[PDB]
Amino acid sequence: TQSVCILGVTGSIGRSTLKILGQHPDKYSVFAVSAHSRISELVEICKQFRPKVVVVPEQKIAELKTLFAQQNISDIDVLAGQEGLVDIASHTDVDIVMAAIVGAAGLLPTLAAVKAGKRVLLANKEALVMSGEIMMQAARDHQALLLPVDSEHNAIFQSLPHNYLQADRTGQPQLGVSKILLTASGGPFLNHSLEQLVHVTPQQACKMGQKISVDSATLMNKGLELIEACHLFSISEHFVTVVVHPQSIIHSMVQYVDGSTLAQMGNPDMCTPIAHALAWPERLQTNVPALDLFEYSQLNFQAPDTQKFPALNLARQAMRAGGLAPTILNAANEIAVEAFLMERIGFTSIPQVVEHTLEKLENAAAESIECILDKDKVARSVAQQYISSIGG
Amino acid sequence: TQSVCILGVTGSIGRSTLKILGQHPDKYSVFAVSAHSRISELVEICKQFRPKVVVVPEQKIAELKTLFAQQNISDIDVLAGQEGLVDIASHTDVDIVMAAIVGAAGLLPTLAAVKAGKRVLLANKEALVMSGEIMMQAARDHQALLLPVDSEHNAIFQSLPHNYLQADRTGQPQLGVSKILLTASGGPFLNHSLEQLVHVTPQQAQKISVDSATLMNKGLELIEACHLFSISEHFVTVVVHPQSIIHSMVQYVDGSTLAQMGNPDMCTPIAHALAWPERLQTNVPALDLFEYSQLNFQAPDTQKFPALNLARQAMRAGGLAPTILNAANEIAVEAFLMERIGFTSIPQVVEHTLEKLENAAAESIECILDKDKVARSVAQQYISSIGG
DSSP: OEEEEEESOSSHHHHHHHHHHHHOTTTEEEEEEEOSSOHHHHHHHHHHHOOSEEEEOGGGHHHHHHHHHHTTOOSOEEEEHHHHHHHHHTOTTOOEEEEOOOSGGGHHHHHHHHHTTOEEEEOOSHHHHTTHHHHHHHHHHHTOEEEEOSHHHHHHHHHSOTTGGGSOOSBSOOTTEEEEEEEEOOOTTTTOOHHHHHTOOHHHHTOOOHHHHHHHHHTHHHHHHHHHHHHHTTBOGGGEEEEEOTTOOEEEEEEETTSOEEEEEOOSOTHHHHHHHHHTTSOOOOOOOOOOTTTSOEEEOBOOOTTTOTHHHHHHHHHHHOTTHHHHHHHHHHHHHHHHHTTSSOTTHHHHHHHHHHHHSOOOOOOOHHHHHHHHHHHHHHHHHHHHHTTO | OEEEEEESOSSHHHHHHHHHHHTOTTTEEEEEEEOSSOHHHHHHHHHHHOOSEEEEOGGGHHHHHHHHHHTTOOSOEEEEHHHHHHHHHTOTTOOEEEEOOOSGGGHHHHHHHHHTTOEEEEOOSHHHHTTHHHHHHHHHHTTOEEEEOSHHHHHHHHHSOTTGGGSOOSBSOOTTEEEEEEEEOOOTTTTOOHHHHHTOOTTTOOHHHHHHHHTHHHHHHHHHHHHHTTBOGGGEEEEEOTTOOEEEEEEETTSOEEEEEOOSOTHHHHHHHHHTTSOOOOOOOOOOTTTSOEEEOBOOOTTTOTHHHHHHHHHHHOTTHHHHHHHHHHHHHHHHHTTSSOGGGHHHHHHHHHHHSOOOOOOOHHHHHHHHHHHHHHHHHHHHHTTO
């Protein structure tokens, strides 16, 4: 039986993870969990799974402890903040870490888990977008098992040779792989003209949270996923083709030198890739319905319009540049998206903010979390300044 | 370097195989080849690949030796007939056997290759349709490597766990597999009504083309799939997919479905099976989904195309039932082509033969061919009884 630490248990990834673990108590146990919010739900989680340790931010400590006392919950160690997160992520009694904390808050704990040699299930973009080199290097150095939880990357993993983890890491596809096809929904503005794109509203672009939704509309979401893919699978961006696939039933593909293309596909349920990564190389029973192609009876593909959606090329540009370029891209995009949602700039100005920031800000090596966050902060400032300069 | 024996080298599978081998002379050599026809083309093949042994039917011996003399080709042993086929298929100096001879004529050579412990690339249906249990048992008993060359079965192979050959053989899916999705083009009469199917003509529908129209081709592949992957028929779902870009799929207990897809080129699955578990470079163009931008799926109408259910019935019955089904179908197709019976009468012939003829264990090749002959006789008698 293997112990699991869930970083960010109250979110959607966290809940999907618990559904799986709750159906396999004979194979998995929950040693520790963390949450930044929904503390009441956290207490209900603790009742059922009884972790030894729980971590919340300092601001949430008194709330947690009051709810515990009120629900007569004892024998659970409560830790606070980043130090707490690090402690449970690297804990001796932890085998598996679900890294589902998004943003800068998750970097230090995710890196601690990697350096402690755990099976690390990546369920956040920032680990590889911001600190990709450090994370992969740490994994090699400390013999950690780094496995992707997000749908596209897990699809690629399932479509790669079973032993691709043992392949040479050179930027070149290995073991008969010739290309990776990264599938994208295309967003709600797939069939918009250039002029129509200029006038789309925040409400339209949010049609699953707002940041991801806007990023899915600009294709920056795929741009970020491409950067991650390049780090994770040690493959240069020019071996990655983005394919727009509106039904999003096929989750990504891998092409081979004999002419074969392999695909992973399924119903939209994160329990599938979570279960795969959790138990790999073994398969794990879930309650996810089998894919019914008689109902979902059509799949479509088309090329992304890089003129209409320049975010993709910006992401490739950042990837080629390496270093802190993807960090700069990510920071600027966040500020731009926020500006767009607050109706301060237009939709088409989002890649403009990103492009400007990448141009103005000097690149450097992503050598540490500290350097990364420092550059992230400056990039946000530069983006904001530029937004002001264009009337935002 | 590994030596290859190609049974049926002048056919389309044979030619595709040679294209691959000719691009990898550093990894593969051709030791022996056989052909039933296209002797002149066989000569040109011999010039380029210089096999040590060539096998042709007795009727083709004089023609071959004359062409050999005329083209000044020497130092190649010529063997004749079934004994010759068995000799090269089981030859000590052979590592790999491409079994591309179709029909009952391919059975004894294919089995010999299997019992000799060769890597056997299966490119004919009869080996598993007629003699499935015996072939699969022989493969296990003699440490042979039986790998599918046909598109759908190779796709399933590529979509299964990498170690699925080591899984238990129980009839149940193993290693987290929940379902196999066997894809089908659906044939030319995919969307016809029941009444419309009655009036389709031979010209609108040679055997393989007809079998695709009746979905019997898919029924035969279902039977092969069940033997090959040691899985009961009720775990195999037929999915009609007209573009035939997805070549088949496998579903898993975690909700995942894995698929193999590609351009229609037999070099892809041949190269895969030839070099498995290694990948082998081919000139097959990468699948371009920007051009082939749409894929569709639908359920086969088992009422409109009963051939599928008959295959499942035969599979459930086991024993010689798949042999009986295959034999009856061939007589029925042949009758339909000669305009003796209607199109919808083909499964009627099959079903009647399966009902009239007593089943038994497929204990031996001899017992299989005996029942095959009787099935043909029974089918032919029924055809006459319905005015054919």
